[PDB]
Amino acid sequence: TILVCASEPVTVDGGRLLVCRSPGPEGFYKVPLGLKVALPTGYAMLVAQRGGGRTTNGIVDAGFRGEVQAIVAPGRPRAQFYCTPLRLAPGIATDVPFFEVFAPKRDEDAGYDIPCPRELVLPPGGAETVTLPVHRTDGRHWAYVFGRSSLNLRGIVVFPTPWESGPCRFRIQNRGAHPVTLESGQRVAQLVLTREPLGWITGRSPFPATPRAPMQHRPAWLFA
Amino acid sequence: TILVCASEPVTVDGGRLLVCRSPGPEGFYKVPLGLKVALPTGYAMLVAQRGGGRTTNGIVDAGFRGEVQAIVAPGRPRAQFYCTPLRLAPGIATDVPFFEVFAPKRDEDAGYDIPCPRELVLPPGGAETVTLPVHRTDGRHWAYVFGRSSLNLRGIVVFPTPWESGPCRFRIQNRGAHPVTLESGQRVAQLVLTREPLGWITGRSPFPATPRAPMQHRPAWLFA
Ligand SMILES: O=c1ccn([C@H]2C[C@H](O)[C@@H](COP(=O)(O)O)O2)c(=O)[nH]1
Numbered sequence: 001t002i003l004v005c006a007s008e009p010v011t012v013d014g015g016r017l018l019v020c021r022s023p024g025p026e027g028f029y030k031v032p033l034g035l036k037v038a039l040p041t042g043y044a045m046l047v048a049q050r051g052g053g054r055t056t057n058g059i060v061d062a063g064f065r066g067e068v069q070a071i072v073a074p075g076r077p078r079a080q081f082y083c084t085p086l087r088l089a090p091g092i093a094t095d096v097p098f099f100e101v102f103a104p105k106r107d108e109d110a111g112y113d114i115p116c117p118r119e120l121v122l123p124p125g126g127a128e129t130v131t132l133p134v135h136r137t138d139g140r141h142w143a144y145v146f147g148r149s150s151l152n153l154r155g156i157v158v159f160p161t162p163w164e165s166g167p168c169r170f171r172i173q174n175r176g177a178h179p180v181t182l183e184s185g186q187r188v189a190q191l192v193l194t195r196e197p198l199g200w201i202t203g204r205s206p207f208p209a210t211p212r213a214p215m216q217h218r219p220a221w222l223f224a
Numbered sequence: 225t226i227l228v229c230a231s232e233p234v235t236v237d238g239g240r241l242l243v244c245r246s247p248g249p250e251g252f253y254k255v256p257l258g259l260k261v262a263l264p265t266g267y268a269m270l271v272a273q274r275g276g277g278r279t280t281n282g283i284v285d286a287g288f289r290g291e292v293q294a295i296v297a298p299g300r301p302r303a304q305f306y307c308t309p310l311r312l313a314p315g316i317a318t319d320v321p322f323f324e325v326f327a328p329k330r331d332e333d334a335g336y337d338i339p340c341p342r343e344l345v346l347p348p349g350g351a352e353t354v355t356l357p358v359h360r361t362d363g364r365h366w367a368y369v370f371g372r373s374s375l376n377l378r379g380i381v382v383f384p385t386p387w388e389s390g391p392c393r394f395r396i397q398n399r400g401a402h403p404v405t406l407e408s409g410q411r412v413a414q415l416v417l418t419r420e421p422l423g424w425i426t427g428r429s430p431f432p433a434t435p436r437a438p439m440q441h442r443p444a445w446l447f448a
């Protein structure tokens with residue numbers, strides 16, 4: 001059971017929260033969704049757009065008690081936003097010890113921060129493929145590289161990328177106005193482990209919309 | 225906590241449930257609203273339209289486990305429906321013993337049935353004022369005459385009416401095509417006692433909309 005305090009109308013739709021708001025065409029900036037959630041430990045929540053491509057995928061963790069915001073890129077002025085709770089997995093097997101690559105987190109936190117393995121100078125519009133020296137050794141849960149809120153707000157956009165085979169890889173693109181430098185060791189993304197796959201997440205696009213289909217392990221929402 | 229099992233999108237707005245459906249122009253008929261509720265004992269729920277003049281006010285009582293529906297008159301093809309939880313008051317102080325007028329109820333039921341004092345013959349379009357020989361002795365709680373869902377369906381429409389001072393009175397209108405005859409003793413409306421006012425209820429309208437303003441005591445909804 002997820003607790004939901006809401007200052008504005010919220011639609012519950014196929015297991016996920018749906019909010020209709022009309023941000024401006026500018027970006028990148030934070031679009032308040034009119035609700036707060038209290039996720040139980042072991043849950044996180046994906047925030048993304050319903051049927052459009054101007055929103056960074058966000059991750060709300062179980063310790064977050066502020067208003068939920070969508071962070072959007074420059075785009076068409078109206079938007080619908082989905083929130084999908086994610087049942088977290090404990091870990092995944094890796095050939096290298098897991099915490100020699102990813103940073104330790106709290107049980108309350110959703111994801112494991114990913115330090116940049118090398119300096120990166122992204123000119124405006126520039127993209128780079130970031131690759132980590134670690135492999136998965138089986139397929140018991142799922143794992144996903146997502147951006148970090150701080151970077152998404154700067155228009156430095158990690159492409160939400162699945163990780164089931166090969167090395168941990170993700171694309172990062174600077175949609176900002178100025179060139180950006182990511183220092184080696186800087187926390188540039190996060191790794192989320194899930195009990196159930198996020199089938200739509202492909203790694204090929206900056207702004208993957210969450211599809212309208214309902215989910216399989218739907219939790220309960222309490223509107224208080 | 226009220227428990228909602230929703231097979232369709234439901235909007236939580238300012239404490240009410242909001243549903244947008246596309247009923248046909250015809251009336252009278254039941255419009256399914258995509259949800260079932262398990263009200264706790266001592267709760268009812270008002271079903272009415274939000275911003276249109278087409279829908280009879282209904283009462284879902286605590287025992288009802290089927291699909292919540294709205295019973296609409298003939299009219300416009302588009303419609304939004306509010307569901308307003310109602311905290312029942314246990315009784316009201318009256319000048320004559322309550323149960324000499326109002327029929328007794330179960331605790332799972334929401335309203336106390338109102339037997340028609342005399343016979344009414346209602347030509348199509350014709351309304352009448354029923355008056356019951358009982359007065360209130362204090363404003364302890366609120367009291368409202370609503371319709372009964374069986375008569376709403378037949379176009380025989382009780383005007384939702386408040387009962388603060390004077391005698392229990394209510395108007396009842398036959399918006400059907402054919403004359404109707406209400407028999408003496410027949411159960412022709414229902415009386416509903418509430419801890420909080422339904423401030424917009426006037427008695428002078430067949431299809432009062434429920435206004436958009438959020439309620440005083442938002443209850444907890446649990447989607448499951
Ligand atoms: O379309 C309808 C018709 C009837 N009921 C009912 C059966 C109960 O009579 C009713 C609540 O009114 P009371 O019985 O408490 O008065 O819930 C509904 O929920 N939806």
Ligand SMILES: [Mg+2]
Nearest residue numbers: 371372373374
């Ligand atoms: Mg009824």
